[PDB]
A and B are shown apart, each in its own frame.
Chain A
Amino acid sequence: VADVVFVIEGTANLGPYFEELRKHYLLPAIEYFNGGPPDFGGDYGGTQYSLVVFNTVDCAPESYVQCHAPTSSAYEFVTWLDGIKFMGGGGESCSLIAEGLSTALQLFDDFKKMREQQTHRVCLLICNSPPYLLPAVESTTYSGCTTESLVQKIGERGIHFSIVSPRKLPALRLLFEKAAPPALLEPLQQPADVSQD
């Protein structure tokens, strides 16, 4: 139960803004599943989640993914990745991470092998720069596109997925509602933390 996924990618595009968003959207979201971030035992408790933030090909010709957050007790490594994510990312502003979200799908896969005995799987991804790229994975067997990623995240599994970007709105939300299963990308609002994004 309560199988959530936390993703952010705008580190290269916009770092400080995330720090602001953390003060209003990221931190309250975690409190929905914990009595308060302190330092506790970690195991297969259902309510665990991951923390995935990477960069683009601009100044990283030797690294795309280094995620590691199986349980983290939802407090310690969560707060760590929040406050110690990154400060890099240059090049230009055309695309930061699309191939990342595909890997995110792969993460859900391991839940099928780990969360045996449903769980109403949920996921959330953040990215300031509007992404677009030809490559798909370059890391694993699975391959596709942004369209393939979203149809997998919606149809293949009923994972509720939203994108709480900065107050600005790019040309992304439009295509991300072409899924017959309700995407529910609504939680991009200055109002307080939604119950389940």
Chain B
Amino acid sequence: FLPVMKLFDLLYPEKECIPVPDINKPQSTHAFAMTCIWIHLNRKAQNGDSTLQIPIPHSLKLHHEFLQIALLCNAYSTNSECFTLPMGALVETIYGNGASVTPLPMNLLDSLTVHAKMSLIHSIATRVIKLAHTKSSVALAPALVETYSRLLVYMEIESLGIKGFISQLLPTVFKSHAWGILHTLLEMFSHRMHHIQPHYRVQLLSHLHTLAAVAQTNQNQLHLCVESTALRLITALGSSEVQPQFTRFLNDPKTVLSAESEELNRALILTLARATHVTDFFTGSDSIQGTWCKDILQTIMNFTPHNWASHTLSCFPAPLQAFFKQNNVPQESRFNLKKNVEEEYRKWKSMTDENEIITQFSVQGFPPLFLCLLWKMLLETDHISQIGYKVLERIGARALVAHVRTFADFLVYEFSTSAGGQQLNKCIEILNDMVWKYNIVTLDRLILCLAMRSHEGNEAQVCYFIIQLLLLKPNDFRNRVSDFVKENSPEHWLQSDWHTKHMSYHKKYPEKLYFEGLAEQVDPPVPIQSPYLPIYFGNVCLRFLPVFDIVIHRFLELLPVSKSLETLLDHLGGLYKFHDRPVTYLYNTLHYYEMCLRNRDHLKRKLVHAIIGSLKDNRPQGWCLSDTYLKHAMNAREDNPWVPEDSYYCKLIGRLVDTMAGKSPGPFPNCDWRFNEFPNPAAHALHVTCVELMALAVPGKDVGNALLNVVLKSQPLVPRENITAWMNAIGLIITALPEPYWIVLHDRIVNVISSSSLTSETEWVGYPFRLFDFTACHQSYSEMSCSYTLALAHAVWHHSSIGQLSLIPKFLTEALLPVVKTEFQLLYVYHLVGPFLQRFQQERTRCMIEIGVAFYDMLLNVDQCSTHLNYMDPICDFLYHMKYMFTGDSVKEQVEKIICNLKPALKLRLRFITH
């Protein structure tokens, strides 16, 4: 540090006095930096007890004694002797106290925590772990731990630390019930912190799964919420993350992943399908690499969900569980219906005078035996008689999942057996109305249970109206979510009063769930169970995402469902203010629907105005040019946005090429580069690209042509000095578009560009190398359109080089065969496919052989149709390179069956290929 400090004082502090008093209440660290480094080197000298205690603080002598404003609390505590006065300057825990039951509101991030990193690392950590060691001796007063959750760089520096601390706390399950610490933070820790390392987050997911399974949970009755939380971590990030981490969960499925979280496992496999959709992990092989997922299927085969039974098997990459289709045994062979009905009748007649014994008889849950009792109660004018309340509080804590599954199944069966309207009206009047007050589910669990049996072959056509009436029922709770607008838009990152806000919220709307709405014989209120209740049930929004997905992405056959969905967000749009990733949420919805959605796409002409409505639920001031599209897409949408979008596209991609050195890093990014998915603004590009004109017949062909017009035609704004970055950005975009959009591109390229005339006599420009090589655009000539297109391909293949290459072999095997006669066309297709063999040698090993045999097929074709080869040695040493560097010694035999029937000259030329 000696030379560094010397050079810093020399260069930076170049003066002879002590200027710049620098009060600077907003920010003064930059000014006091020199004084602080001098204080630190003096502290080091004093610790060494030598070097004259580092004298001469002259330069900033005044600032040397500035210690004797809350924002001016620059804690230099890290060095020494600043843990009494400066440490107390920071808001500590509450020791005076033990519904505003928490004083000392939270501190702001930008104010002081932006700088105090080297000092505050584990200060509050030691306190909280010391409190956690023995027990929760008193009701935990410090709720300031929210600030502890509002620590991003701190986690970035001590991720391993908090993991180790949590693992060391884990023996709390042997100590006392594992409650008094975990339910304290695991929710808010996961809510307030959105961005985290992927390996770390999947390890946390695994640990949470184990903790849910082991140890025993039968004593933790409120663990239900813990399940819901676990949903987010597997649903909100499942795009390309699970596959690299395959090595880290090689043994976890072998021991425990299917204990009781069957709904979690279903959401997991749905997200896994969504992920593996990109990029074509099922096309190449059949069951070789399937070990990556087949083990997972093992879990699924423990309970065999997803049993359409050859009815609507179209929205999947490749149905592998379709082999295990007979293990479903739906509706228990259609016979156990009346049997369980008679069973529950007999059990009712018995429990009439056996309650004190049926308490101990009703063990093991007995799903299609007990919950049907509900069908009786409130059906006989509130004939509950509180006999079942104790039973539910004792046994139905966990097994309620299969219970409500059978309940959904039975209610759908009843709605179907109604058959005419004699009951439908009575249903809407009483049956779906009594479920409101006061079910423990609170419209949270029923969605996935309904989904598990709705998509089945039995009565998929009428559960539609069930979902319809279900979404139409909310008219007393949705108003709470409606007035809940004033929590996120005002403050979502700069929390200053959220504490009392959510306090008043959980005081106003909810009253109680553990007791009944009717006071039985004895009811001691004693309201004390409120240690930590920051969020009550707002988290459902996470699981609210599959609701649409399972009802839109899965059910799209009947069009009037549109009339449903447009209402939902119209009442719950504002609820979306926690995450925005529509790309992974919408891409799967059109993987193969386009070829048949066209007519229904007319109704999508409405749905887009709904989907963009979900985009409307965001007020960060982050859009200044998409608003042009918005304005030109509000009146007579079937007139304006067809053509000029091309230019608009340029404007759009302009921002892309404005990502590097321009002025776009101004008002575009804000608030706070932390949770708005901003590692790079490039991710903002793919936002609208697909949903732009998917309403009309624009997709299929016109979209690809529009995307490629930026190349073959000289756009006015397009400058000829940086087209490289332009094509790069075009490829970046293309990487996020559905199949046909970027497959029509290949057909357009090979259609006429590679074959304008090019066979009889193109021109004296037929020199292949100068033309087909890029960077010739550096001059205002030698920029023939075709060559441009070449780079175009390279462009996308400059970034789409993960799994998309599996497309080119087929794309070769047919298409490139009957289009090539001469040799420069061969050099062209070579340059097209050539410089990518490394990606096949690495991953797509099975396809490089096809690429090679395609090369040799082109060779045989140009040999059979040619007067004489003009550029023999180029192709010769080209093939030499390809052989000696990429094919090794595998294809040697097959090429033989072609290489023998070549021209004698070519035969002598390629003689040494035999070995």
Contact = CB atoms under 8 A, between A and B. Distances in A.
Interface of A: 34-36, 39-41, 43-45, 47
A35 B52 contact: yes
B51 A45 contact: no
A175 to B, nearest CB: 39
B885 interface: no
Interface string B39-63: 0000000000011111110110000
A45 B560 CA distance: 86
A39 B9 CA distance: 13
Contact of B52 (A34, A39, A44): A34
Contact of A43 (B3, B16, B51, B54): B16
Nearest to A31: B52
Contact of B58 (A34, A36, A39, A45): A45
B643 interface: no
Contact of B50 (A36, A41, A45, A47): A36
Contacts of B2: 39-40
A44 B50 contact: no
B528 interface: no
28 contacts: A35-B51, A35-B52, A35-B53, A36-B50, A36-B51, A36-B52, A39-B2, A39-B3, A39-B6, A40-B2, A40-B51, A40-B54, A41-B5, A41-B6, A41-B9, A41-B10, A41-B56, A43-B9, A43-B16, A43-B56, A43-B58, A43-B59, A44-B16, A44-B58, A45-B55, A45-B56, A45-B58, A47-B56
Contacts of A36: 50-52
List 9 tightest A-B contacts by C-beta distance, closest first.
A35-B52, A45-B56, A41-B9, A35-B51, A44-B16, A41-B6, A45-B58, A39-B2, A34-B52
A190 B6 CA distance: 37
Contacts of A44: 16, 58
Contacts of A35: 50-53
A98 B51 CA distance: 37
A41 B6 CA distance: 5
Nearest to B6: A41
A79 to B, nearest CB: 16
Nearest to A33: B52
Nearest to B17: A44
A90 to B, nearest CB: 40
A35 B3 CA distance: 18
Interface of B: 2-3, 5-6, 9-10, 16, 50-56, 58-59
Nearest to B14: A43
A75 to B, nearest CB: 11
A72 to B, nearest CB: 13
A117 to B, nearest CB: 10
A41 B51 CA distance: 13
Contacts of B55: 45
Nearest to B38: A41
Nearest to B8: A41
Contacts of B52: 34-36
A45 to B, nearest CB: 4
Residue of A35, A36, A39 with highest tally of chain B CB at under 10 A: A35
Contacts of B5: 41
Binding site secondary structure of chain A: loop
A40 B6 contact: yes
Contacts of B9: 41, 43
A119 to B, nearest CB: 14
Contacts of A45: 55-56, 58
A41 B55 CA distance: 10
Contacts of A34: 52
A35 B56 CA distance: 12
Nearest to B56: A45
B267 to A, nearest CB: 62
Contacts of A47: 56
Nearest to A44: B16
A36 B56 CA distance: 15
Contacts of A41: 5-6, 9-10, 56
Nearest to B5: A41
A43 to B, nearest CB: 6
A47 B55 CA distance: 11
Contacts of B50: 35-36
A47 B58 CA distance: 12
Residue of A35, A41, A45, A47 with highest tally of chain B CB at under 10 A: A41
A44 B52 CA distance: 17
Nearest to B54: A40
Given A36-B51, A40-B6, 20 more contacts: A34-B52, A35-B51, A35-B52, A35-B53, A36-B50, A36-B52, A39-B2, A39-B6, A40-B2, A40-B51, A40-B54, A41-B5, A41-B10, A43-B9, A43-B56, A43-B58, A45-B55, A45-B56, A45-B58, A47-B56
Nearest to B45: A35
A34 B52 CA distance: 6
Contacts of B53: 35
A43 B55 CA distance: 12
A184 B258 CA distance: 96
A176 to B, nearest CB: 33
A43 B58 CA distance: 8
A43 B52 CA distance: 16
A76 to B, nearest CB: 10
A43 B16 CA distance: 7
A36 B2 CA distance: 15
A92 to B, nearest CB: 45
A36 B49 CA distance: 12
Contacts of A43: 9, 16, 56, 58-59
Nearest to B58: A45
B387 to A, nearest CB: 86
B60 to A, nearest CB: 11
Contacts of A40: 2, 6, 51, 54
Nearest to B16: A44
Contacts of B6: 39-41
A39 B5 CA distance: 10
A35 B42 CA distance: 13
A71 B597 CA distance: 84
A41 B56 CA distance: 9
Contacts of B3: 39
Nearest to B50: A35
B502 to A, nearest CB: 53
A11 B69 CA distance: 61
Nearest to A41: B9
B146 to A, nearest CB: 44
A44 B58 CA distance: 8
Nearest to B53: A35
Contacts of B10: 41
B319 to A, nearest CB: 74
A162 to B, nearest CB: 25
A36 B51 CA distance: 6
A132 B31 CA distance: 56
A47 B52 CA distance: 13
A39 B1 CA distance: 11
A41 B7 CA distance: 8
Nearest to A48: B56
A39 to B, nearest CB: 6
A73 to B, nearest CB: 9
A111 to B, nearest CB: 14
A60 B21 CA distance: 52
A34 B51 CA distance: 8
Residue of A34, A36, A40, A47 with highest tally of chain B CB at under 10 A: A40
Contacts of B51: 35-36, 40
Contacts of B54: 40
A43 B34 CA distance: 15
A41 B37 CA distance: 13
Nearest to B10: A41
A40 B54 CA distance: 9
A36 B52 CA distance: 8
B50 to A, nearest CB: 6
A118 to B, nearest CB: 18
A188 B9 CA distance: 39
A40 B7 CA distance: 10
